[PDB]
Amino acid sequence: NFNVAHGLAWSYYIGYLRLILPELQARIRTYNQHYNNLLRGAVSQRLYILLPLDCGVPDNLSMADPNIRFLDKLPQQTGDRAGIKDRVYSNSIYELLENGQRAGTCVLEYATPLQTLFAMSQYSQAGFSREDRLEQAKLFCRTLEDILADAPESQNNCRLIAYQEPSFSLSQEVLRHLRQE
Amino acid sequence: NFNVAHGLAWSYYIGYLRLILPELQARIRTYNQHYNNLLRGAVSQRLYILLPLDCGVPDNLSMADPNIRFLDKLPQQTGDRAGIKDRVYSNSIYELLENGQRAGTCVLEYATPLQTLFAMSQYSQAGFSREDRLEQAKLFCRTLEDILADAPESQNNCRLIAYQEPSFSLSQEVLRHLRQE
Numbered sequence A, B: 001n002f003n004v005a006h007g008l009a010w011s012y013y014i015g016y017l018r019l020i021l022p023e024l025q026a027r028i029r030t031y032n033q034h035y036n037n038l039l040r041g042a043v044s045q046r047l048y049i050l051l052p053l054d055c056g057v058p059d060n061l062s063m064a065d066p067n068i069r070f071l072d073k074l075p076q077q078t079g080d081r082a083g084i085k086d087r088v089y090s091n092s093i094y095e096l097l098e099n100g101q102r103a104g105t106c107v108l109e110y111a112t113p114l115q116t117l118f119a120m121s122q123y124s125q126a127g128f129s130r131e132d133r134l135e136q137a138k139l140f141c142r143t144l145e146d147i148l149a150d151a152p153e154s155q156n157n158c159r160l161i162a163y164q165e166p167s168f169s170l171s172q173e174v175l176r177h178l179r180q181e
Ligand SMILES: Nc1ncnc2c1ncn2[C@@H]1O[C@@H]2CO[P@@](=O)(S)O[C@@H]3[C@H](O)[C@@H](CO[P@@](=O)(S)O[C@H]2[C@H]1F)O[C@H]3n1cnc2c(=O)[nH]ncc21
Pocket: A011, A012, A014, A015, A016, A088, A089, A090, A111, A112, A113, A114, A115, A116, B008, B011, B012, B013, B014, B015, B016, B084, B087, B088, B089, B090, B112, B113, B116
């Protein structure tokens, strides 16, 4: 089933990352200058995408790890698309606590197509087994990695974070990539 | 490339139609009772999805056919998803003119994965030809049709409109399905 993950990675790029990444620097700059608290640390540049290879995608990040608390939303981005006038592309800012203290703030979210791959393995009509789900999660990340390496929209404004759980601290995995800048 | 369209149809259902169709009747009922003009006709029930098999998906419907003018938006639906707090699912209401007069109003939009399939055929890194795009557009509609026929969320609240252009009047194609209720 090579084509499911390949097709989903191309979709995630065309209908989402190629549309929001060119205008993401302006949205973060706008937040830091007019909506961000003058005393707190600046929101880091780049969209951080969590890619769990087990496809365990919760709807709220505070459940996945306690040290990732929701801070605020970025200014909404709108655009007419496929007949929907002013479709909204919203992104959330999170705090990454270390020793009970704000160590970094960034725009963070899961790659939604991995939640879709998990759900596909649960429906019988889909005809997709859970053994095929692990390789499809890897294929999705490799395809997206290849697309972004040669993409003009990807210009130091996106970071992929792949990981596999066997104590795995998700906040430390994000802080490792965030401090590498 | 059977798996690209199959994977995109399952995605369109899991990450979109299974989430918005159970609460679509309430959104239309709310519009008709509090936001709709008391003198104009009621907004019809069901989400009408345009499925052009040529994958020609414009961002605005008034370009595709002049007799489809934008009326207003439905009340926005929000939900926390894949780490995005209050992600917005917005839908647009359109008027269908016949002989220069409002013949019907409905929630109408294109299936966005078909715009993605068109774009995939244009990128060389995707490895997807334009001959394979026509069969993939058909495979997507068949798979979505099969999913919705046995879906509990699909309970008289969704209508698929597939068509192929060779004068094709899109407004008449929508009014034909709308009057069949
Ligand atoms: N605003 C946003 N916030 C966060 N992530 C966003 C995003 N937009 C896009 N993405 C990301 O890119 C993928 C391709 O997005 P598309 O719109 S091209 O089509 C998708 C896909 O076919 C399927 C699965 O959904 P999922 O979220 S897993 O996949 C998304 C997601 F991973 O449902 C469609 N679908 C989903 N929502 C809507 C909607 O509102 N209208 N019409 C259609 C629609």
